[PDB]
Amino acid sequence: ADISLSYANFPPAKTFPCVQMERWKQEVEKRTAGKVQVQTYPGSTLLGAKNTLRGVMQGQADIGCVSLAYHPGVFPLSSVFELPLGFTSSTSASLALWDLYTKYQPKEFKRFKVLTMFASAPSNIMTKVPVRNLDDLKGLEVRASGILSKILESLGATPVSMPMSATPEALQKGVVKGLFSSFEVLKDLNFAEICRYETETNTAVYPFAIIMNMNSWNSLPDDVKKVLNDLGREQAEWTGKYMDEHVKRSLAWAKDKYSIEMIKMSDADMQAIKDKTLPLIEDWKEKAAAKGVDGAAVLSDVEELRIKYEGKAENLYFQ
Ligand SMILES: [Cl-]
């Protein structure tokens, strides 16, 4: 190759942000006929959580993976995708996020080439004892942090912060009685052994951006830029599909091994959750306004994109 790019990624190799990174590498090397090579650095071996943004800006790495939620205030527009907005899959959230970015071109990313974006699967409640309604959450100790803790507090539950590593013992001791995370942990971290009741609240996702140093981007010939540009939407879709299938495999494994049960709360309970969490949306809108973003316009557009990628309404023909 004549062009060599380093790709920093903070989480462990086995996790979805790194898995998609490797697939992206494969497609870039193939589609450029070997003109570009990519060296990957999973698990914070080049840049980690503390220095991916600055590190990419400085060229310490050519490319890096950012979890937007870890940098409050830095992404006033794209952070909308941290909120409880009703997304029910990684695929739909990933594609909606990419579309929103492409539409708005927010200045929060002006220092970088944004190579792709994607989102986690939605956060759900996984517990030792079934949570079938909101009364079941009252006073319930659940491992959570950030916005998910805020949501639990608003629902009358008891969010507890603690390291993922300490959570198994904590669960067994009753220090927490479940966790608020995406379903892949049921298999990947064997949480299904302990938490065999999974309540699908589809609460929120975590959005990510793959960013590239502008000098590095500038250096690429036009044919290479086209390859990377074309991969933006493709990689958003690929990552979401990978993640949704990875969740599907987690759940099937857990059902086969421990007979886990999938639970949905009533429509009335789901509306109560919305009503109780509306302040988080209002907070975000004030934050957006303070940085010159039209928060209501963005939220409207997000729902339009959600329906585009998920819509459950029946065909007009049958209405
Ligand atoms: Cl390198």
PDB file of C-alpha atoms in Angstrom, residues 21-250:
ATOM      1  CA  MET A  21     -13.756  -1.534  12.620  1.00  0.00           C
ATOM      2  CA  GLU A  22     -12.198  -4.787  11.351  1.00  0.00           C
ATOM      3  CA  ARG A  23     -14.917  -5.246   8.723  1.00  0.00           C
ATOM      4  CA  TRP A  24     -14.436  -1.658   7.583  1.00  0.00           C
ATOM      5  CA  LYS A  25     -10.700  -2.325   7.239  1.00  0.00           C
ATOM      6  CA  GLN A  26     -11.410  -5.423   5.167  1.00  0.00           C
ATOM      7  CA  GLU A  27     -13.643  -3.512   2.760  1.00  0.00           C
ATOM      8  CA  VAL A  28     -11.308  -0.526   2.475  1.00  0.00           C
ATOM      9  CA  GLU A  29      -8.261  -2.662   1.657  1.00  0.00           C
ATOM     10  CA  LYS A  30     -10.255  -4.712  -0.849  1.00  0.00           C
ATOM     11  CA  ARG A  31     -12.041  -1.837  -2.595  1.00  0.00           C
ATOM     12  CA  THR A  32      -8.858   0.224  -2.953  1.00  0.00           C
ATOM     13  CA  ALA A  33      -7.045  -2.754  -4.483  1.00  0.00           C
ATOM     14  CA  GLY A  34      -4.519  -2.648  -1.703  1.00  0.00           C
ATOM     15  CA  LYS A  35      -3.635   1.027  -2.165  1.00  0.00           C
ATOM     16  CA  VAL A  36      -4.718   1.640   1.430  1.00  0.00           C
ATOM     17  CA  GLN A  37      -3.741  -0.425   4.443  1.00  0.00           C
ATOM     18  CA  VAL A  38      -5.296   0.004   7.899  1.00  0.00           C
ATOM     19  CA  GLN A  39      -3.668  -0.900  11.223  1.00  0.00           C
ATOM     20  CA  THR A  40      -6.195  -1.360  14.006  1.00  0.00           C
ATOM     21  CA  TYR A  41      -5.707  -0.676  17.692  1.00  0.00           C
ATOM     22  CA  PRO A  42      -8.581  -2.168  19.728  1.00  0.00           C
ATOM     23  CA  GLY A  43      -8.655  -1.955  23.492  1.00  0.00           C
ATOM     24  CA  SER A  44      -7.140   1.484  23.885  1.00  0.00           C
ATOM     25  CA  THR A  45      -3.709   0.413  22.650  1.00  0.00           C
ATOM     26  CA  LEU A  46      -3.117   3.654  20.745  1.00  0.00           C
ATOM     27  CA  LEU A  47      -5.798   6.065  22.003  1.00  0.00           C
ATOM     28  CA  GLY A  48      -8.419   5.387  24.661  1.00  0.00           C
ATOM     29  CA  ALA A  49     -11.457   7.084  26.166  1.00  0.00           C
ATOM     30  CA  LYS A  50      -9.374   9.959  27.531  1.00  0.00           C
ATOM     31  CA  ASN A  51      -7.642  11.020  24.343  1.00  0.00           C
ATOM     32  CA  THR A  52      -9.357   9.788  21.173  1.00  0.00           C
ATOM     33  CA  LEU A  53     -10.783  13.208  20.204  1.00  0.00           C
ATOM     34  CA  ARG A  54      -7.638  15.162  20.835  1.00  0.00           C
ATOM     35  CA  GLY A  55      -5.476  12.324  19.590  1.00  0.00           C
ATOM     36  CA  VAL A  56      -7.180  12.136  16.237  1.00  0.00           C
ATOM     37  CA  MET A  57      -7.187  15.957  15.949  1.00  0.00           C
ATOM     38  CA  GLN A  58      -3.436  15.911  16.554  1.00  0.00           C
ATOM     39  CA  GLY A  59      -2.822  13.017  14.153  1.00  0.00           C
ATOM     40  CA  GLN A  60      -1.641  10.567  16.812  1.00  0.00           C
ATOM     41  CA  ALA A  61      -4.113   8.282  15.094  1.00  0.00           C
ATOM     42  CA  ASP A  62      -5.618   8.801  11.660  1.00  0.00           C
ATOM     43  CA  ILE A  63      -9.013   7.460  12.704  1.00  0.00           C
ATOM     44  CA  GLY A  64     -10.792   6.944  15.988  1.00  0.00           C
ATOM     45  CA  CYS A  65     -14.079   5.779  17.546  1.00  0.00           C
ATOM     46  CA  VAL A  66     -16.031   8.159  19.748  1.00  0.00           C
ATOM     47  CA  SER A  67     -18.899   7.313  22.105  1.00  0.00           C
ATOM     48  CA  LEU A  68     -20.730  10.629  22.042  1.00  0.00           C
ATOM     49  CA  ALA A  69     -22.390  10.202  25.445  1.00  0.00           C
ATOM     50  CA  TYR A  70     -18.975  10.246  27.152  1.00  0.00           C
ATOM     51  CA  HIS A  71     -18.450  13.889  26.066  1.00  0.00           C
ATOM     52  CA  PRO A  72     -21.405  15.986  27.240  1.00  0.00           C
ATOM     53  CA  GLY A  73     -21.518  19.376  25.605  1.00  0.00           C
ATOM     54  CA  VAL A  74     -19.223  18.423  22.747  1.00  0.00           C
ATOM     55  CA  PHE A  75     -22.022  17.094  20.469  1.00  0.00           C
ATOM     56  CA  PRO A  76     -25.092  19.265  21.031  1.00  0.00           C
ATOM     57  CA  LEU A  77     -26.852  18.036  17.887  1.00  0.00           C
ATOM     58  CA  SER A  78     -25.893  14.371  17.588  1.00  0.00           C
ATOM     59  CA  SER A  79     -26.352  13.779  21.327  1.00  0.00           C
ATOM     60  CA  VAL A  80     -30.102  13.786  20.588  1.00  0.00           C
ATOM     61  CA  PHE A  81     -29.567  10.084  19.918  1.00  0.00           C
ATOM     62  CA  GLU A  82     -28.755   9.492  23.616  1.00  0.00           C
ATOM     63  CA  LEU A  83     -32.345  10.296  24.594  1.00  0.00           C
ATOM     64  CA  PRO A  84     -35.294   7.915  24.968  1.00  0.00           C
ATOM     65  CA  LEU A  85     -36.749   8.381  21.500  1.00  0.00           C
ATOM     66  CA  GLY A  86     -38.398   5.037  20.881  1.00  0.00           C
ATOM     67  CA  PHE A  87     -35.802   3.293  18.695  1.00  0.00           C
ATOM     68  CA  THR A  88     -36.198  -0.482  18.888  1.00  0.00           C
ATOM     69  CA  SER A  89     -33.094  -1.738  17.079  1.00  0.00           C
ATOM     70  CA  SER A  90     -29.459  -0.918  16.398  1.00  0.00           C
ATOM     71  CA  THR A  91     -30.137  -1.000  12.664  1.00  0.00           C
ATOM     72  CA  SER A  92     -32.802   1.685  12.703  1.00  0.00           C
ATOM     73  CA  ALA A  93     -30.977   3.887  15.175  1.00  0.00           C
ATOM     74  CA  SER A  94     -27.703   3.568  13.246  1.00  0.00           C
ATOM     75  CA  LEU A  95     -29.232   4.500   9.918  1.00  0.00           C
ATOM     76  CA  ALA A  96     -31.314   7.313  11.435  1.00  0.00           C
ATOM     77  CA  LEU A  97     -28.187   8.717  13.114  1.00  0.00           C
ATOM     78  CA  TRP A  98     -26.200   8.688   9.854  1.00  0.00           C
ATOM     79  CA  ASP A  99     -29.085  10.335   7.998  1.00  0.00           C
ATOM     80  CA  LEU A 100     -29.457  13.015  10.662  1.00  0.00           C
ATOM     81  CA  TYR A 101     -25.734  13.755  10.516  1.00  0.00           C
ATOM     82  CA  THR A 102     -25.764  13.895   6.721  1.00  0.00           C
ATOM     83  CA  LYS A 103     -28.714  16.285   6.760  1.00  0.00           C
ATOM     84  CA  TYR A 104     -27.457  18.683   9.414  1.00  0.00           C
ATOM     85  CA  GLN A 105     -23.665  18.570   8.947  1.00  0.00           C
ATOM     86  CA  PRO A 106     -23.318  19.861  12.495  1.00  0.00           C
ATOM     87  CA  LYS A 107     -20.323  22.004  13.295  1.00  0.00           C
ATOM     88  CA  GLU A 108     -19.489  19.789  16.274  1.00  0.00           C
ATOM     89  CA  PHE A 109     -17.709  17.602  13.703  1.00  0.00           C
ATOM     90  CA  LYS A 110     -16.124  20.385  11.667  1.00  0.00           C
ATOM     91  CA  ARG A 111     -12.547  19.423  12.607  1.00  0.00           C
ATOM     92  CA  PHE A 112     -12.922  15.888  11.254  1.00  0.00           C
ATOM     93  CA  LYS A 113     -14.031  13.799   8.350  1.00  0.00           C
ATOM     94  CA  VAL A 114     -16.915  11.735   9.707  1.00  0.00           C
ATOM     95  CA  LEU A 115     -16.338   8.303   8.142  1.00  0.00           C
ATOM     96  CA  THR A 116     -19.446   6.615   9.577  1.00  0.00           C
ATOM     97  CA  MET A 117     -21.759   6.633  12.589  1.00  0.00           C
ATOM     98  CA  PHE A 118     -23.730   3.947  14.360  1.00  0.00           C
ATOM     99  CA  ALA A 119     -25.587   3.142  17.565  1.00  0.00           C
ATOM    100  CA  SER A 120     -25.752   0.382  20.128  1.00  0.00           C
ATOM    101  CA  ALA A 121     -28.819  -1.808  20.559  1.00  0.00           C
ATOM    102  CA  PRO A 122     -31.376  -0.329  22.923  1.00  0.00           C
ATOM    103  CA  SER A 123     -31.005  -0.490  26.692  1.00  0.00           C
ATOM    104  CA  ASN A 124     -33.342  -2.874  28.472  1.00  0.00           C
ATOM    105  CA  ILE A 125     -33.926  -4.101  32.024  1.00  0.00           C
ATOM    106  CA  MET A 126     -32.527  -7.521  32.899  1.00  0.00           C
ATOM    107  CA  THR A 127     -33.394  -8.812  36.357  1.00  0.00           C
ATOM    108  CA  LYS A 128     -33.407 -11.699  38.845  1.00  0.00           C
ATOM    109  CA  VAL A 129     -37.124 -11.374  39.477  1.00  0.00           C
ATOM    110  CA  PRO A 130     -39.616 -10.446  36.746  1.00  0.00           C
ATOM    111  CA  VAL A 131     -40.368  -6.769  36.131  1.00  0.00           C
ATOM    112  CA  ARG A 132     -43.826  -6.978  34.555  1.00  0.00           C
ATOM    113  CA  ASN A 133     -45.034  -3.493  35.446  1.00  0.00           C
ATOM    114  CA  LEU A 134     -43.949  -0.204  36.936  1.00  0.00           C
ATOM    115  CA  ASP A 135     -44.847  -1.216  40.465  1.00  0.00           C
ATOM    116  CA  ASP A 136     -42.220  -3.969  40.168  1.00  0.00           C
ATOM    117  CA  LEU A 137     -39.529  -1.269  39.685  1.00  0.00           C
ATOM    118  CA  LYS A 138     -40.346   0.596  42.898  1.00  0.00           C
ATOM    119  CA  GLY A 139     -37.287   0.544  45.102  1.00  0.00           C
ATOM    120  CA  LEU A 140     -35.591  -2.015  42.857  1.00  0.00           C
ATOM    121  CA  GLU A 141     -31.794  -1.847  42.944  1.00  0.00           C
ATOM    122  CA  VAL A 142     -30.478  -1.855  39.340  1.00  0.00           C
ATOM    123  CA  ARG A 143     -26.972  -1.335  38.000  1.00  0.00           C
ATOM    124  CA  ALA A 144     -26.870   1.758  35.837  1.00  0.00           C
ATOM    125  CA  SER A 145     -25.032   4.972  35.116  1.00  0.00           C
ATOM    126  CA  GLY A 146     -25.536   8.207  33.202  1.00  0.00           C
ATOM    127  CA  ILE A 147     -28.936   8.744  31.604  1.00  0.00           C
ATOM    128  CA  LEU A 148     -30.168   5.267  32.500  1.00  0.00           C
ATOM    129  CA  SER A 149     -29.686   6.051  36.197  1.00  0.00           C
ATOM    130  CA  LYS A 150     -31.690   9.240  35.733  1.00  0.00           C
ATOM    131  CA  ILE A 151     -34.452   7.224  34.079  1.00  0.00           C
ATOM    132  CA  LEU A 152     -34.493   4.667  36.884  1.00  0.00           C
ATOM    133  CA  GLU A 153     -34.697   7.415  39.508  1.00  0.00           C
ATOM    134  CA  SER A 154     -37.652   8.935  37.642  1.00  0.00           C
ATOM    135  CA  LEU A 155     -39.413   5.547  37.711  1.00  0.00           C
ATOM    136  CA  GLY A 156     -38.954   5.164  41.459  1.00  0.00           C
ATOM    137  CA  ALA A 157     -36.194   2.551  41.197  1.00  0.00           C
ATOM    138  CA  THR A 158     -32.772   2.638  42.869  1.00  0.00           C
ATOM    139  CA  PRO A 159     -29.902   3.027  40.395  1.00  0.00           C
ATOM    140  CA  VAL A 160     -26.562   1.777  41.656  1.00  0.00           C
ATOM    141  CA  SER A 161     -23.208   2.443  40.009  1.00  0.00           C
ATOM    142  CA  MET A 162     -20.619  -0.301  40.190  1.00  0.00           C
ATOM    143  CA  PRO A 163     -18.076  -1.981  37.951  1.00  0.00           C
ATOM    144  CA  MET A 164     -19.386  -4.551  35.494  1.00  0.00           C
ATOM    145  CA  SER A 165     -16.879  -6.960  37.101  1.00  0.00           C
ATOM    146  CA  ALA A 166     -18.463  -6.567  40.570  1.00  0.00           C
ATOM    147  CA  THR A 167     -22.031  -6.887  39.332  1.00  0.00           C
ATOM    148  CA  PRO A 168     -22.322 -10.700  39.318  1.00  0.00           C
ATOM    149  CA  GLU A 169     -21.462 -10.912  43.027  1.00  0.00           C
ATOM    150  CA  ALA A 170     -23.600  -7.861  43.741  1.00  0.00           C
ATOM    151  CA  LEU A 171     -26.526  -9.548  42.006  1.00  0.00           C
ATOM    152  CA  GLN A 172     -26.056 -12.731  44.020  1.00  0.00           C
ATOM    153  CA  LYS A 173     -25.913 -10.738  47.267  1.00  0.00           C
ATOM    154  CA  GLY A 174     -28.926  -8.632  46.306  1.00  0.00           C
ATOM    155  CA  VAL A 175     -26.862  -5.428  46.284  1.00  0.00           C
ATOM    156  CA  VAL A 176     -28.357  -4.967  42.850  1.00  0.00           C
ATOM    157  CA  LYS A 177     -31.146  -7.139  41.500  1.00  0.00           C
ATOM    158  CA  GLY A 178     -30.603  -6.458  37.802  1.00  0.00           C
ATOM    159  CA  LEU A 179     -28.954  -4.220  35.255  1.00  0.00           C
ATOM    160  CA  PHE A 180     -29.888  -1.701  32.590  1.00  0.00           C
ATOM    161  CA  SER A 181     -27.953  -2.417  29.421  1.00  0.00           C
ATOM    162  CA  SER A 182     -28.274  -3.948  25.984  1.00  0.00           C
ATOM    163  CA  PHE A 183     -29.235  -7.625  25.771  1.00  0.00           C
ATOM    164  CA  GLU A 184     -25.902  -8.836  24.385  1.00  0.00           C
ATOM    165  CA  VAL A 185     -24.530  -8.936  27.952  1.00  0.00           C
ATOM    166  CA  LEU A 186     -26.827 -11.881  28.693  1.00  0.00           C
ATOM    167  CA  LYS A 187     -24.438 -14.116  26.744  1.00  0.00           C
ATOM    168  CA  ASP A 188     -21.270 -12.024  26.381  1.00  0.00           C
ATOM    169  CA  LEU A 189     -20.940 -11.558  30.147  1.00  0.00           C
ATOM    170  CA  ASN A 190     -23.139 -14.528  31.115  1.00  0.00           C
ATOM    171  CA  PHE A 191     -25.626 -12.303  32.932  1.00  0.00           C
ATOM    172  CA  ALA A 192     -28.402 -14.692  31.891  1.00  0.00           C
ATOM    173  CA  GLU A 193     -27.206 -17.214  34.483  1.00  0.00           C
ATOM    174  CA  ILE A 194     -28.438 -14.847  37.164  1.00  0.00           C
ATOM    175  CA  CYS A 195     -30.959 -12.567  35.421  1.00  0.00           C
ATOM    176  CA  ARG A 196     -33.483 -14.728  33.642  1.00  0.00           C
ATOM    177  CA  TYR A 197     -36.231 -12.128  33.153  1.00  0.00           C
ATOM    178  CA  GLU A 198     -35.635  -9.610  30.421  1.00  0.00           C
ATOM    179  CA  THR A 199     -37.995  -6.637  30.135  1.00  0.00           C
ATOM    180  CA  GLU A 200     -37.814  -4.971  26.733  1.00  0.00           C
ATOM    181  CA  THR A 201     -38.254  -1.285  27.452  1.00  0.00           C
ATOM    182  CA  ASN A 202     -36.246  -0.148  24.387  1.00  0.00           C
ATOM    183  CA  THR A 203     -35.167   2.816  26.432  1.00  0.00           C
ATOM    184  CA  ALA A 204     -32.333   4.526  24.562  1.00  0.00           C
ATOM    185  CA  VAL A 205     -29.228   3.769  22.510  1.00  0.00           C
ATOM    186  CA  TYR A 206     -25.632   5.013  22.614  1.00  0.00           C
ATOM    187  CA  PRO A 207     -24.479   6.820  19.464  1.00  0.00           C
ATOM    188  CA  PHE A 208     -20.935   6.587  18.075  1.00  0.00           C
ATOM    189  CA  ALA A 209     -18.946   8.419  15.426  1.00  0.00           C
ATOM    190  CA  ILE A 210     -15.926   7.245  13.467  1.00  0.00           C
ATOM    191  CA  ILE A 211     -13.762  10.315  12.900  1.00  0.00           C
ATOM    192  CA  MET A 212     -10.722  10.890  10.714  1.00  0.00           C
ATOM    193  CA  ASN A 213      -7.978  13.503  11.030  1.00  0.00           C
ATOM    194  CA  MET A 214      -8.491  16.223   8.424  1.00  0.00           C
ATOM    195  CA  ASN A 215      -4.890  16.228   7.199  1.00  0.00           C
ATOM    196  CA  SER A 216      -5.129  12.466   6.761  1.00  0.00           C
ATOM    197  CA  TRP A 217      -8.414  12.833   4.837  1.00  0.00           C
ATOM    198  CA  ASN A 218      -6.999  15.637   2.696  1.00  0.00           C
ATOM    199  CA  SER A 219      -4.092  13.410   1.655  1.00  0.00           C
ATOM    200  CA  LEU A 220      -6.332  10.768   0.083  1.00  0.00           C
ATOM    201  CA  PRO A 221      -6.725  10.666  -3.716  1.00  0.00           C
ATOM    202  CA  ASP A 222     -10.244  11.227  -5.050  1.00  0.00           C
ATOM    203  CA  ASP A 223     -10.827   7.554  -5.882  1.00  0.00           C
ATOM    204  CA  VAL A 224      -9.950   6.557  -2.324  1.00  0.00           C
ATOM    205  CA  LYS A 225     -12.187   9.336  -0.932  1.00  0.00           C
ATOM    206  CA  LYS A 226     -15.041   7.942  -2.988  1.00  0.00           C
ATOM    207  CA  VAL A 227     -14.553   4.484  -1.484  1.00  0.00           C
ATOM    208  CA  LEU A 228     -14.606   5.897   2.031  1.00  0.00           C
ATOM    209  CA  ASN A 229     -17.538   8.181   1.285  1.00  0.00           C
ATOM    210  CA  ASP A 230     -19.579   5.320  -0.144  1.00  0.00           C
ATOM    211  CA  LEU A 231     -18.837   3.245   2.953  1.00  0.00           C
ATOM    212  CA  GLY A 232     -20.374   5.812   5.309  1.00  0.00           C
ATOM    213  CA  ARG A 233     -23.999   4.753   4.979  1.00  0.00           C
ATOM    214  CA  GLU A 234     -23.051   1.145   4.238  1.00  0.00           C
ATOM    215  CA  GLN A 235     -21.016   0.842   7.422  1.00  0.00           C
ATOM    216  CA  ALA A 236     -23.768   2.416   9.531  1.00  0.00           C
ATOM    217  CA  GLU A 237     -26.173  -0.262   8.211  1.00  0.00           C
ATOM    218  CA  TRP A 238     -23.649  -3.079   8.469  1.00  0.00           C
ATOM    219  CA  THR A 239     -22.876  -2.265  12.089  1.00  0.00           C
ATOM    220  CA  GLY A 240     -26.499  -2.003  13.130  1.00  0.00           C
ATOM    221  CA  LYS A 241     -27.343  -5.270  11.438  1.00  0.00           C
ATOM    222  CA  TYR A 242     -24.365  -6.976  13.039  1.00  0.00           C
ATOM    223  CA  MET A 243     -25.402  -5.714  16.464  1.00  0.00           C
ATOM    224  CA  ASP A 244     -29.061  -6.716  16.078  1.00  0.00           C
ATOM    225  CA  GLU A 245     -28.010 -10.204  14.967  1.00  0.00           C
ATOM    226  CA  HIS A 246     -25.547 -10.380  17.861  1.00  0.00           C
ATOM    227  CA  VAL A 247     -28.425  -9.561  20.231  1.00  0.00           C
ATOM    228  CA  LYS A 248     -30.573 -12.187  18.554  1.00  0.00           C
ATOM    229  CA  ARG A 249     -27.833 -14.786  19.100  1.00  0.00           C
ATOM    230  CA  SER A 250     -27.378 -13.710  22.733  1.00  0.00           C
TER     231      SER A 250
END
